[PDB]
């Protein structure tokens, strides 16, 4: 389920989500 | 399951154990090498972990215990047990390096690993031999390699300690294990244990700020070490921790040396004097009850003064201090738990206030004096890191938006930058590389849009700063300027301290409705 290698693929300052 | 039983047996065999001592190791190594062959021509990195835990670690531990018989001298002791050690160590080293050589001989790792990695390991050089970056097997191979580099590192550290006469160690004594650990961190930066072992090296040279920083990195990486917080705590939170007691001795040595202003002293003050400040926020009781407890205000004033007056030759340590501090806020939350009381909210708020005090000091006295500096990446990199951290946590964003000093500082910086949409780039910068898989910035600095990088060639090299398109230091500085103006404008958009863009001046000014 969890890949330990660095993955570049996956908020910018809004208080409200 | 059945595999676990086998390695437990290796351990028990060796516990019972001149020559037959080497013989036993050789037999066990022979079986393990065979498991690893069957695994590599998900078991691989697991086989190596059981190898360290059940075979190697218990051996190395025994040499430690015994070495500590010497120091509490035993001359005849030193060379004798150093003699039997040198009978065993080349085999241990071979078990791990064999596996590396095996791995690199069968498979091409260039889709996952920086190309120059083979070179760095002195490993010499089919279409299907190239591992695709998404297979389970490809992950297993890289993890196996990372383990080999990790346990070579630990073994090297252990050897150096035994090969040493005193507990005095100069800086470069651990250069060799640090190189292996550096490579291990590079290929899989998510693994906290690599940072932990690096920090352990720095405890020997009494670089306790470097140690604390590495301990923090080890606790907050995407796959953290369980020993991360215990070691951090042993250093900063446990009145009886061996590391803590040593820290206090270092603070003693520095106290009597504050009059000297050689660079080496300025640097050590910046490495050390932030420690009691962080310590007192996370572990308040520990730092109210020691001989340095009444010097807390002194630590901060001298730290801040050194930063203002001596940043030029010491900026690299100031950079480290920033990341340690950011990380330490999350150390605080893991160690002290979710805030609930009015008192626990205020304690947590007090730490955040100190952190932003550090930020504004950095901005006002350092970055503002160096925002044009194209030679040193650290100045604008520190600003990127602040913003990337702030955008990553709602509570931190809210505090920052309501901080008048911090908003004022970013306005001043942004206005200087403007006087000099989302930016892109072709590769990672120094600060990106350093913080890969760092939890507080969400594992990657997301101010740039690195969206397209994944569709570009030589991606592993790109993500370690290597590419055909390398920009001048100036261009890289220009790129940081753009991303900072962009992030700062997004941040300022909803600040609560009255700052707004004057659309005639095209600069940020302070406003009110009356």
Cβ-based contacts under 8 A for chains A and B: 50
Closest CA to B277 of B355, B211, B389, B359: B355
Experimental method: X-ray
Angle (nearest 5°) at CA B104 between B102 and B110: 160
Q: Is B190 close to A4, i.e. CB distance below 8 A?
A: yes
Cα B64 vs. chain centroid, distance in angstroms? 26
Rounded to 5 degrees, φ, ψ at B340 are -140, -60
- Residues of chain B with C-beta less than 8 angstroms from the C-beta of A9: 454
Q: Which neighbouring-strand residues pair with B223?
A: B191
From the list B258, B260, B284, the residue with the least C-alpha distance to B344 is B284
3-state secondary structure B145-194: HHHHHHHHHHHHHHHHHHHCCCCCCCHHHHHHHHHHHHHHHHHCCCEHHH
Residue B184 and residue B146 in contact, taking contact as beta carbons nearer than 8 Å: yes
Angle between helices B394-401 and B342-365 (to 10 degrees): 60
| Long-range CB pairs of B342-349, under 8 A, 24+ apart, other chains included | B347/B281, B347/B284, B349/B399
Domains of chain B, CATH where assigned: 1-188 (1.25.40)
| Contact between B453 and A3 using a beta-carbon 8 Å cutoff | no
Strands B507-510 and B499-502: antiparallel
- Give Cα separations from B136 to B37, B44, B174, B399 (angstroms): 17, 12, 34, 42
Report residue B464: phi and psi, to 5°: -125, 30
Sign of the Cα pseudo-torsion (B449, B453, B455, B460, in order)? negative
Cα gap B66→A11, rounded to integer Å: 54
Tell me the C-alpha distance between B293 and B35, whole Å: 54
B137 HSE (CA, 13 A, CB side) = 12
Q: Residue B323 and residue B215: Cα distance in Å, rounded? A: 12
Contact present, B447 and A16 (Cβ < 8 Å): no
Rounded distance, CA B109 to CA B143, Å?
12
CB-nearest to A4 from B191, B444, B454 is B191
- Nearest residue on chain A to B486, alpha-carbon basis: A12
> How is B432-469 classified by DSSP, letter by letter?
HHHTTTBGGGTTS--SS--GGGGGSSSHHHHTTT--S-
What residues are paired with B385 via a beta bridge?
none
Q: What are φ and ψ of residue B105, in 5° steps? A: -85, -30
């Amino acid at each position: 389920i969890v890949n330990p290698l660095f993955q570049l693929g996956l908020n910018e300052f809004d208080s409200q989500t | 399951t059945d595999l676990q039983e086998t390695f437990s047996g290796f351990q028990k065999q060796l516990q019972s154990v001149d020559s037959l001592m080497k013989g036993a190791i050789q037999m066990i190594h022979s079986k393990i090498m065979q498991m690893l062959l069957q695994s590599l021509i998900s078991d691989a990195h697991r086989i190596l972990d059981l190898t360290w835990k059940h075979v190697h670690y218990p051996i190395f531990k025994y040499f430690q215990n015994w070495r500590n018989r010497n120091v509490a001298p035993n001359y005849a002791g030193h060379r004798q047990l150093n003699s039997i050690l040198q009978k065993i160590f080349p085999q241990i080293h071979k078990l791990y390096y064999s596996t590396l050589e095996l791995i690199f001989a069968n498979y091409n790792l260039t889709a996952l690993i920086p190309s120059d990695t083979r070179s760095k390991l002195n490993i010499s050089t089919d279409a299907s031999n190239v591992l695709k970056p998404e297979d389970s097997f490809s992950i297993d191979c890289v993890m196996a390699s990372q383990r080999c580099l990790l346990y070579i590192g630990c073994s090297q550290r252990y050897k150096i300690i035994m090969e040493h006469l005193s507990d005095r160690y100069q800086q470069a004594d651990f250069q060799k294990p640090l190189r292996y650990l550096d490579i291990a961190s590079t290929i899989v930066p998510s693994v906290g244990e690599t940072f932990l072992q690096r920090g352990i090296c720095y405890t020997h040279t009494k670089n306790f700020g470097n140690a604390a920083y590495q301990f923090v990195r080890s606790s907050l990486s995407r796959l953290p070490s369980d020993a991360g917080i215990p070691n951090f705590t042993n250093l900063l939170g446990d009145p009886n921790g061996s590391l803590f007691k040593k820290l206090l001795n270092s603070l003693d040595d520095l106290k009597v040396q504050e009059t000297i202003k050689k660079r080496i002293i300025n640097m050590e003050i910046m490495e050390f004097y932030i420690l009691p400040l962080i310590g007192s926020h996370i572990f308040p009781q520990t730092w109210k009850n020691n001989r340095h407890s009444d010097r807390l205000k002194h630590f901060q004033t001298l730290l801040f003064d050194k930063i203002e007056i001596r940043y030029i030759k010491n900026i690299s340590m100031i950079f480290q201090d920033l990341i340690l501090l950011i990380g330490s806020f999350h150390m605080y939350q893991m160690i002290n738990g979710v805030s609930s009381n009015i008192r626990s909210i205020q304690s947590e708020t007090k730490f955040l206030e100190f952190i932003f005090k550090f930020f504004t000091h950095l901005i006002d006295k350092v970055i503002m004096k160096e925002f044009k500096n194209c030679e040193m990446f650290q100045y604008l990199a520190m600003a990127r890191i602040m913003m990337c951290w702030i955008k990553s946590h709602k509570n931190v964003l809210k505090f920052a938006h309501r901080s008048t000093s911090f908003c004022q500082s970013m306005v001043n910086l942004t206005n200087e930058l403007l006087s000099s949409h989302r930016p892109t780039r072709d590769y990672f910068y120094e600060e990106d590389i350093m913080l890969k898989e760092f939890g507080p910035t969400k594992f990657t600095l997301s101010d740039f849009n690195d969206e397209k990088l994944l569709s570009m060639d030589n991606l592993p090299d790109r993500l370690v700063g290597k590419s055909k398109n390398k920009l001048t230091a100036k261009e890289e500085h220009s790129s940081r300027v753009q991303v900072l103006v962009y992030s700062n404008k997004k941040f300022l958009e909803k600040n609560c301290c009255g700052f707004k863009l004057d659309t005639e001046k095209k600069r940020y000014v302070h406003t009110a409705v009356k």
